[PDB]
Amino acid sequence: ALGKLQDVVNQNAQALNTLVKQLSSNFGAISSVLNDILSRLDPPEAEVQ
Amino acid sequence: VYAWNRKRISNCVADYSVLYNSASFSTFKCYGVSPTKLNDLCFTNVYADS
């Protein structure tokens, strides 16, 4: 019966999860973490990724 | 070239300062990493294809 509420809550959480998981996507970059690119590639090369 | 030799480097420390500072290399191009950052990086393994 409480679904109307629970449902809503889930959606919120769901969105956040998706958002957080979008931190782990390459989007075409060599890696999905900025620190690795900064530590490996020089700014002239790193900036495109 | 068709039988390019491969060597494995593991469990060791390499000083790459002497590597990129040498003028005996005509071409020296790094992809996905910078020559200077090598001394400040750790890698599980290295494969040298000669």
Coordinates of N, CA and C in Angstrom, one line a residue, chain A residues 38-42 45, chain B residues 30 32-34 37 41:
Chain A
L38 N 45.7 12.9 -15.5 CA 46.6 13.9 -15.0 C 47.9 13.4 -14.7
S39 N 48.0 12.3 -14.0 CA 49.3 11.7 -13.7 C 50.0 11.1 -14.8
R40 N 49.3 10.7 -15.9 CA 50.0 10.0 -17.0 C 50.2 11.0 -18.2
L41 N 49.2 11.7 -18.6 CA 49.3 12.6 -19.8 C 49.7 14.0 -19.4
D42 N 50.5 14.7 -20.2 CA 50.8 16.1 -20.0 C 49.6 16.9 -20.4
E45 N 48.2 17.0 -23.9 CA 47.5 15.8 -24.3 C 46.3 15.5 -23.4
Chain B
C30 N 55.4 9.0 -26.6 CA 54.6 8.3 -25.6 C 53.2 8.6 -25.9
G32 N 49.3 7.9 -24.2 CA 48.6 7.6 -22.9 C 49.4 7.9 -21.7
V33 N 50.7 8.4 -21.8 CA 51.5 8.7 -20.6 C 52.6 9.6 -21.1
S34 N 53.2 10.4 -20.1 CA 54.2 11.3 -20.4 C 55.6 10.8 -20.0
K37 N 56.6 11.6 -16.3 CA 55.8 11.0 -15.2 C 56.2 9.6 -14.9
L41 N 55.4 7.0 -11.3 CA 54.3 6.0 -11.6 C 54.8 4.6 -11.3

